[PDB]
Design a protein around this ligand. Structure first.
Ligand SMILES: C[C@H](S)C(=O)NCC(=O)O
Ligand SMILES: [Zn+2]
Ligand SMILES: [Zn+2]
Length: 236
């Protein structure tokens, strides 16, 4: 079902295409106590296979994503990468595993997952001192370039860039350019957030479209605005 802003709504989910081979999947959870909070992930068509970034809030919603891919793209999903251990990102792991999809996550995310009430991914990504993922730990990721910017939204948020496009996924590290706060600061590293935000921008300097978890895709203005807000917080 197409809407005003060019977003196709598919059941309780919403899908928007960002590039010839990149879609953004959006799911909603009526959050206690807040309201209906949106969460964004990515779907990437890489040849004869599909790559998924982040699940939905629930197993059923993630299964709905899988149905959409089967219906709209019709290609086997090779792998999934989840960006950190919160429900909006890892709430539908069982749906992926029941579908036989190999799942990947930061080793710290997999370690933190039980405490965060999550199901861990099946494989662990580790990272070099400069932030880039060990290539041996992220095999055949195609156009996906995974980067750990340091502690920000959580101690474990990783970010993904997509080769061939100008799209980088900041996840819940980056907020939009009109955000007046940084949101859920429960697991946040207020001391290193700003550094992490700028590190992300430096990792993908040629990315002009920044996709984030809870807002529509923004420009690089979101990165500098986030880091600026993170500075204000750190300076008390
Ligand atoms: C404000 C934060 S980033 C949110 O929307 N959800 C946090 C969570 O999924 O646990
Ligand atoms: Zn989170
Ligand atoms: Zn979140």
């Amino acid at each position: 079902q197409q809407m005003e802003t060019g977003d196709q709504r598919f059941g309780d989910l919403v899908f928007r295409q960002l590039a010839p081979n990149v879609w953004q999947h959006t799911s909603y959870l009526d959050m206690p106590g807040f309201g209906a909070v949106a969460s964004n992930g990515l779907i990437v068509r890489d040849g004869g296979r599909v790559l998924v970034v982040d699940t939905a809030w629930t197993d059923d919603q993630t299964a709905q994503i899988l149905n959409w891919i089967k219906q709209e793209i019709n290609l086997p999903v090779a792998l999934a990468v989840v960006t950190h251990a919160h429900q909006d990102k890892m709430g539908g792991m069982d749906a992926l595993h029941a579908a036989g999809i190999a799942t990947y996550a930061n080793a710290l995310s997999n370690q933190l997952a039980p405490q965060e009430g999550m199901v861990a991914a099946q494989h662990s990504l580790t990272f070099a001192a400069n932030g880039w993922v060990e290539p041996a730990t992220a095999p055949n990721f195609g156009p996906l370039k995974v980067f750990y910017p340091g502690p920000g939204h959580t101690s474990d948020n990783i970010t993904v860039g997509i080769d061939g496009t100008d799209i980088a996924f900041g996840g819940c590290l980056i907020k939009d350019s009109k955000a007046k706060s940084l949101g859920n600061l429960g697991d946040a590293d207020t001391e290193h957030y700003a550094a992490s935000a700028r590190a992300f921008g430096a990792a993908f300097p040629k990315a002009s479209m920044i996709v984030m978890s809870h807002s529509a895709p923004d420009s690089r203005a979101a990165i500098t605005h986030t880091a600026r807000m993170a500075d204000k917080l750190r300076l008390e």
